[PDB]
Amino acid sequence: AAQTNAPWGLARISSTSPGTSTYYYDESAGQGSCVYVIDTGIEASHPEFEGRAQMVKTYYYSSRDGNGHGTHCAGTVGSRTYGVAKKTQLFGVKVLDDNGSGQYSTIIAGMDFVASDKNNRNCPKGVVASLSLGGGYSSSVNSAAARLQSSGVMVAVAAGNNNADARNYSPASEPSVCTVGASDRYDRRSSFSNYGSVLDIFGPGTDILSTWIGGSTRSISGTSMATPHVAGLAAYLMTLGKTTAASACRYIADTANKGDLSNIPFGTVNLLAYNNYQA
Numbered sequence: 001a002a003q004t005n006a007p008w009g010l011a012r013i014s015s016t017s018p019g020t021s022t023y024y025y026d027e028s029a030g031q032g033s034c035v036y037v038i039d040t041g042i043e044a045s046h047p048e049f050e051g052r053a054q055m056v057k058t059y060y061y062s063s064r065d066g067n068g069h070g071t072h073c074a075g076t077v078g079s080r081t082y083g084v085a086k087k088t089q090l091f092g093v094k095v096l097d098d099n100g101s102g103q104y105s106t107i108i109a110g111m112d113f114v115a116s117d118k119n120n121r122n123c124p125k126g127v128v129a130s131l132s133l134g135g136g137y138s139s140s141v142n143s144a145a146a147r148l149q150s151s152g153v154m155v156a157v158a159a160g161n162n163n164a165d166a167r168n169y170s171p172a173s174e175p176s177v178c179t180v181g182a183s184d185r186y187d188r189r190s191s192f193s194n195y196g197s198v199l200d201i202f203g204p205g206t207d208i209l210s211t212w213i214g215g216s217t218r219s220i221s222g223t224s225m226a227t228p229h230v231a232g233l234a235a236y237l238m239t240l241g242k243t244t245a246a247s248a249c250r251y252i253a254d255t256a257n258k259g260d261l262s263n264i265p266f267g268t269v270n271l272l273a274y275n276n277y278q279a
């Protein structure tokens with residue numbers, strides 16, 4: 001299948017070179033997989049989700065996304081126009097408030113919730129969790145992320161936006177999950193993107209168009225935007241049977257575009273998410 005005039009990020013992950021505008025993907029499009037978006041919530045009623053999104057848990061007074069951030073990330077995972085895996089099922093877990101903030105205890109609870117809740121869902125092709133959040137180092141947060149991964153969920157987390165080594169941030173610094181840096185449309189490391197040896201992979205993160213609350217769209221930038229590209233790609237590859245939750249991060253790195261990015265510090269991987277599609 002081919003989506004013409006796609007957002008640049010979608011086009012980039014189906015090409016060996018920058019500057020193309022078509023997103024090429026297999027029609028299966030992540031059908032039968034499930035992705036938990038652990039964030040500010042999801043505006044499930046947005047037409048772009050086509051009924052494939054639902055809120056399953058909130059830690060605040062409402063389950064509504066009053067911020068927009070969660071809806072944007074979910075859109076990059078699996079909206080019709082802006083998503084990587086256009087037929088995946090989306091589950092929202094609201095651990096962040098409408099200002100985009102949350103306590104580590106609540107974030108941990110949200111991760112343990114997903115590890116349990118997945119056992120109650122029909123996700124025959126597998127389960128992914130996308131975490132576009134983080135803060136300073138915390139061994140308890142890292143431990144929660146490791147548990148979620150261990151339970152059989154492909155965990156993707158943002159590297160963070162401090163232009164620093166991700167080793168000092170959580171859950172970014174947990175080695176067992178898939179830590180995602182950001183790049184821009186000219187194959188440069190995004191100027192804000194964290195780096196370091198703990199990074200596994202880069203995805204598009206600068207100027208990413210996706211869904212927003214109030215049934216709208218907007219373009220924003222962050223490692224928050226790169227993470228759902230990788231989460232969506234994992235769901236997509238798991239549906240095709242190419243990999244499993246336990247090894248998807250490794251498989252994505254193995255099959256990535258190598259050496260394409262500029263402004264990568266020595267010791268950081270030069271690997272850009274790529275779906276290897278051939279018609």
Ligand SMILES: [Ca+2]
Pocket residue numbers: 016017257260
């Ligand atoms: Ca290339």
Ligand SMILES: [Ca+2]
Pocket residue numbers: 174175176177178179198199200249
């Ligand atoms: Ca890792």
